[PDB]
Symmetry: D2
């Protein structure tokens, strides 16, 4: 399923990200802000069980507990992802982290580095983060690795994704929960997202 | 209008708050967490205009600018509200802050107090701009609304563009008691507990947020 | 004893606070920043016992545990103090907070408007009284007059700037107190403001 | 020069880090806490300039401005450092983040490792303005300093104004192996553990910071 989070709050931040006038401090900071907000969206979709707690005045009342918050494995795709993940962790403190290294349309992408914790089959909720999904190659390559682990669920957290990508990804993995703030219409020749926001990695790491 | 924010995330934190076993650190911390989350919600209700920015790649594109984020006066109802306001400020760093030291009078009686001797022992509110500012009144719990209504009497006078109320728990009695006397108010809350008890406390409730968070 | 924290880092932030060009966001934010920084300074002065812990290679070694971090009772001198206490809480999360509103009415003394201080454990709690500006030290002394009655294990005072008049009037009446501050300004006018200071902290912070 | 930051506050956090029973969250969180604390310590050694600002009181006063907070490049030695750098950034927001991915060529019981082979699987480092930038290399642990020296190998031909090393724990062997070759480096650390074992692990140490933090 596709989850486009276009509420005023996120669209407001996205705007500042897109604005070529926002410096690296504010750019990185907004990536963090969206990561936490984005993690709160993902939070509401997770499996939870009904519990009972007694209150100070000695009365019992039903409550909620998002159990799966203990079963999260965030996958950091090297670079631009670091800041976004820094937001996600605000919503998934108990999550373990994996990092991946890969690099280059349609051209195949190769994985050159990868240290991922052990994904508990049928239990874990893997969250693969990367601010931008253009052609969707990077993402799909990481996916191969992830599906092998047979996780309970797989989420993809991005800021902007091209239509080409969303469809590319959801067409081969309809069971994947793809979250994003905006879906931009095109990819020029260089494989860039338009309007997009330029190069996230560069705008944040500086 | 009434805004009950009962998404799994907030209901999850509320549970923690209600849990008598939840210690002081965690109690105070969840009040902050909800304040932040509630500010974000309140943020999506604010007036915004569409602007048009230019991306590094040279093109223009429509965006969003919540202009009213520059126009926010938060009212921190002294004590319990401090952790909650800390939360809100994460969503409204351009907000001015008024502090009101209200204090309720205890009354052990037969029924449930309708209104109580609520006198304000403190009140330093910054200048509110008529027909422009969005005043946000914060207080973790609204029981009989005594306190709340008492403050609204002060804020109203300054005719703000609109008034919000941010609470974690609110009794049915109160919600109605406020939306009746001030119908065009934006009341946000995570849960609406059925009834108030013999001593004006909310049931089930989460205990005395004031004591729980400051000790 | 007097603890003047004038390291480059704090003097750097103070400068921004003093600067008339620093807005409500940045002013309030630096009060928070200094609050946690001074909190760490107070931390280094607290009681702590030596403990033993086993490291991941099954090797036991000595370490440190500032348990007194469990016995903190911070007091808000209403308004300007809130942002300051916010940062201190970053260093004393387990602290119980106290709120207290006062006001004036040459060195005109004071009257207590509001006062809610949690129960202080005699010879156990480390009470920390927060208030960014200590001018004629009256507000401060009036609050002390109550805290001292509770015989806490210790008493700290956390401020950003304080006048020499104040530092001396406070440390002369209660010598055992730990007064922390970033700067000690020279004078104060006929009105009672600290010069050059930074203006009305409460107004610069709250707007 | 060597800067051992062993004040009660940092020794208190280190203890928690060493405590094998310190769960992942708390472990990661303390790495952040120390990163920020250690940064404020570094800020205190940076070149500063006296300035003059204006109080609203119309009056004027001399002040401090560590102008060098604009000339900082942090190199996040990959994995272990993420939490550590995450806090240094709390002290150096105007810093550019360089990122090197180092991986040690393990070895098993033999004798005690004197220097190990390092495999570079990633490198994105901004341009270091010669005679201008203060480069800060971060890595929780320094065992044989193999990794460290490997990185210094590049950060040095760039002649930065100054080079800092931020670590939580470093072995005697390492501190000496680094400062003997790069006498003028500013090496910051909370503790200097005595010996290393046959696998090159610090003792007593605190385990594998990367494994503890990334789980
Ligand atoms: N047990 C424990 N958990 C912690 C601690 N600090 C942070 N956490 C958890 O990590 C999450 C994110 O922590 P931070 O990076 O400090 O983020 P934050 O901006 O303070 O977010 P909030 O804590 O929600 O206000 C929190 O929501 C907590 O659930 C700590 O000292 N102990
Ligand atoms: N201009 C400016 N604004 C700041 C600064 N620090 C914080 N703010 C603003 O104040 C809000 C809340 O700041 P913090 O208390 O640091 O909150 P936070 O936990 O860091 O959360 P974030 O919103 O993710 O940064 C931010 O969303 C900013 O809009 C600062 O140094 N400069
Ligand atoms: N048990 C527990 N302790 C917490 C939690 N969040 C914060 N704390 C404690 O409170 C302190 C400060 O918390 P915050 O208000 O989030 O401050 P912060 O800006 O995140 O600062 P640091 O956590 O030190 O990085 C931490 O150092 C913790 O000791 C939490 O979720 N659980
Ligand atoms: N311009 C701008 N600067 C910011 C903002 N938020 C943070 N900063 C800067 O980034 C630094 C660290 O910010 P954060 O990562 O949020 O750190 P923090 O946990 O909030 O800690 P504090 O800065 O003490 O509040 C600060 O020293 C600020 O100079 C923001 O919204 N705008
Ligand atoms: O809707 P109402 O019936 O007026 O009650 C709500 C208020 O009462 C409690 O404060 P209290 O006066 O007990 O002060 P404290 O929280 O600072 O102890 C509570 O924290 C609210 O502030
Ligand atoms: O001082 P040295 O003897 O060179 O060894 C110490 C290094 O080992 C760890 O990284 P590691 O290569 O194990 O990678 P990881 O921490 O990312 O898992 C640590 O982060 C240091 O970089
Ligand atoms: O493979 P694509 O989806 O086309 O592009 C993905 C990468 O390109 C950008 O650097 C993103 O941040 C990812 O790292
Ligand atoms: O009593 P003084 O030390 O002269 O002045 C103290 C108060 O004046 C300022 O508002 C400070 O913030 C304190 O609240
Ligand atoms: O696998 P690595 O991270 O390279 O080495 C792991 C060990 O190194 C650390 O000192 C701890 O003792 C760990 O056991
Ligand atoms: Mg926190
Ligand atoms: Mg109250
Ligand atoms: Mg490592
Ligand atoms: Mg911040």
């Amino acid at each position: 399923p596709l989850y486009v989070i276009d509420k005023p709050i996120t669209l407001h931040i996205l705007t500042q990200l897109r604005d070529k006038y926002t410096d690296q401090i504010n750019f990185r900071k907004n990536l963090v802000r969206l990561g936490r907000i984005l993690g709160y969206e993902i939070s509401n979709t997770l499996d939870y069980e009904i519990v009972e707690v007694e209150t100070p005045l000695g009365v019992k009342t039903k409550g909620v507990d998002i159990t799966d918050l203990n079963n999260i494995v965030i996958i950091n795709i090297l670079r631009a992802a670091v800041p976004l993940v820094e937001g996600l962790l605000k919503a998934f403190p108990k999550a373990r982290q994996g990092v991946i290294g890969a690099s280059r349309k349609d051209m195949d992408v190769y994985i050159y580095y990868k240290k991922i914790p052990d994904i508990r089959a049928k239990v874990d909720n893997v969250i693969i983060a990367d601010p931008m999904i253009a052609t969707a190659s990077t993402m799909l390559k990481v996916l191969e690795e992830v599906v092998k682990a047979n996780p309970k669920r797989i989420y993809i957290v991005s800021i902007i994704s091209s239509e080409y990508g969303v469809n590319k990804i959801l067409s081969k993995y309809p069971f994947i929960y793809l979250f994003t703030v905006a879906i931009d219409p095109e990819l020029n020749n260089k494989g860039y997202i338009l309007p997009g926001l330029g190069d996230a990695g560069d705008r944040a790491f500086g």
